Amino acid sequence: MPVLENRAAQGDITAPGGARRLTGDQTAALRDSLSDKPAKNIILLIGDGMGDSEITAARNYAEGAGGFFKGIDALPLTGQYTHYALNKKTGKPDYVTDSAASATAWSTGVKTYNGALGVDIHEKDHPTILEMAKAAGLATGNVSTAELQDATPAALVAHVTSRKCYGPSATSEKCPGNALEKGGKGSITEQLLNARADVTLGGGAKTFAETATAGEWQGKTLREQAQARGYQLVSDAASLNSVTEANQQKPLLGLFADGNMPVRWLGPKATYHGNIDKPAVTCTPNPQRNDSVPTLAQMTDKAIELLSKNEKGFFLQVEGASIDHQDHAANPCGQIGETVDLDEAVQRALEFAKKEGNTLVIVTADHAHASQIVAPDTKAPGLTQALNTKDGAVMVMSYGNSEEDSQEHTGSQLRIAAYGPHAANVVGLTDQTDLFYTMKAALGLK
């Protein structure tokens, strides 16, 4: 099963045939990529808000228009999928989803309302792909650059009526029925601690400083509860590197930041008439990203090393979280850097898959976002910025869908790409809930 080794423009883009990405007919290669044999493992990579527009701008900047992302662009079976949510009250489609409703969609197979995690419009809990893979005996991993209580990773292990029910204090007032003192399953963090995935890595240390208001570990911080429950706590790249085993008896929990892990590149925020008024921007590496802070490609490599020891197989969800945050912030360099960062993790995932032979790799996003690539001389109503690209040319990016402080998500259908046994199930048009079923069946969970 081939991986697209190189789809970069093959020559001089100004000459006939120079911009071509193919060098020959693909039928045979595509035939060699179809396989319905079972999947022993599944690695799902999610770019938060990484729609086709985000992928194209990132590619233009970092690799040039005719460039190729060795990770993101290498998956050979591609398609487009819909990710609309539901109105809680009416049950009708809500065309633009938040991150919680979409995450719940691919993780349980049921559409839901914006802000909901692991429940339906009736607020009924539904098993997640993670809980099921675990029940079946497979190893499970949940890695992300966001705080672990954010929607994308929270959706694999918590079922709360509202995404804001981070820890005890927010839950008591936002999710009274999920609150431990009120007899419910608990806040997002407490639920994460009960779900016990073998590997969980990300930020969000802050909430672990809260104290249970009821239950066995009442009055102890959730950090104390974790240690007390047998979790291997780790907080830097070195200690993370030390880890040699991770399992149900010795579950690993890496908290690498109080909130979201640091962003990879720095740049100014887009502004009104920024491409006209201000000069072009060249992104700069964030000197605070640190070598004591593991990178997403590092977190992924470790998770795969550890989870692969399980003879039974594994399920791993990896997330490039800050792409969505930076898009909301109208900051091109931060947005693009997190896309580059995500590509590195995709490469470490394909390398394993390629060798292993029974791994389904999937790369996609939860919903589309605000940014659009527009002409250099555009005079737009919103925020824009000109960037000096790898090609030595100027690219102008525009965020114009909100007057509020945050740019908004958008409803367009977007790319889904896969590699391995059962990747055929992402080709053509599909729905995000379909991804739950594809994964459920590829793994043969019943």
Site for its own copies in 69-88 (CB under 8 A): 73, 75-80, 82, 84, 86-87
Q: Is 79 left (phi over 0), alpha (psi -120 to 50) or beta?
A: beta
Q: Which is nearer to its own copies, 55 or 306 (CB)?
A: 55
Residue 235 burial (10 A CB sphere; 0-12, 13-18, 19+): middle
Site for Zn ion in 57-116 (CB under 5 A): 99
Pick what 327 binds: its own copies, Zn ion, none; C-beta below 5 to 8 Å, kind-dependent: none
Q: Tell me the closest approach of the beta carbon of residue 269 to its own copies, in angstroms.
A: 15
Q: Which of 42, 45, 50, 57 is close enough to bind its own copies by CB under 8 A?
A: 57
Taking residues 90 to 129 in sequence order and writing x for each that binds its own copies by CB under 8 A, - otherwise, the string is xxxxxxx--------x--xxxx--------xx----x---
Pick what 321 binds: Zn ion, its own copies, none; C-beta below 5 to 8 Å, kind-dependent: Zn ion
- Quote the CA–CA distance of 14 and 197 in Å, as a whole number: 52
99 is catalytic: yes
Closest by Cα among 131, 133, 157, 127 to 144: 157
Q: Is 30 in the site for its own copies (CB under 8 A)?
A: yes
Q: Is 266 in the site for its own copies (CB under 8 A)?
A: no
Site for its own copies in 311-330 (CB under 8 A): none
- Quote the CA–CA distance of 391 and 63 in Å, as a whole number: 8
Phi, psi of 60 (to 5 degrees): -55, -45
- Quote the CA–CA distance of 412 and 372 in Å, as a whole number: 12
Q: Which residues contact 336 (CB under 8 A, 6 or more apart)?
A: 57, 58, 61, 62, 265, 283
The three-state secondary structure class of 342 is helix
Asked if 338 and 72 touch (Cβ cutoff 8 Å), the reply is no
What count of Cα atoms within 13 Å lies in the side-chain half-sphere of residue 107? 34
**Residue 63, annotated as binding a ligand:** no
Pick what 403 binds: Zn ion, its own copies, none; C-beta below 5 to 8 Å, kind-dependent: its own copies
DSSP class of residue 244?
-
Q: Tell me the closest approach of the beta carbon of residue 9 to its own copies, in angstroms.
A: 7
Pick what 324 binds: its own copies, Zn ion, none; C-beta below 5 to 8 Å, kind-dependent: Zn ion
**Residue 48, annotated as binding a ligand:** yes
Q: Is 271 in the site for its own copies (CB under 8 A)?
A: no
Residue from 33, 35, 53, 99 carrying the catalytic annotation = 99
Q: Tell me the closest approach of the beta carbon of residue 46 to its own copies, in angstroms.
A: 18
Pick what 109 binds: its own copies, Zn ion, none; C-beta below 5 to 8 Å, kind-dependent: its own copies
**How many residues sit in the footprint of Zn ion (CB under 5 A)?**
7
Site for Zn ion in 292-351 (CB under 5 A): 321, 324
If you count DSSP H runs as helices and E runs as strands, how many of each does the chain have, helices first? 14, 18
- Quote the CA–CA distance of 244 and 302 in Å, as a whole number: 9
Q: Which of 148, 370, 439, 443 is close enough to bind its own copies by CB under 8 A?
A: 370
Closest by Cα among 234, 176, 243 to 205: 234
Site for its own copies in 402-421 (CB under 8 A): 402-404, 408-415, 417
**Residue 301, annotated as binding a ligand:** no
Q: Is 289 left (phi over 0), alpha (psi -120 to 50) or beta?
A: alpha
Give catalytic residue positions: 99
Residues in contact with Zn ion by CB under 5 A are: 48, 99, 150, 152, 321, 324, 366
Binding residues for Mg(2+), as ranges, are 48, 150, 152, 319
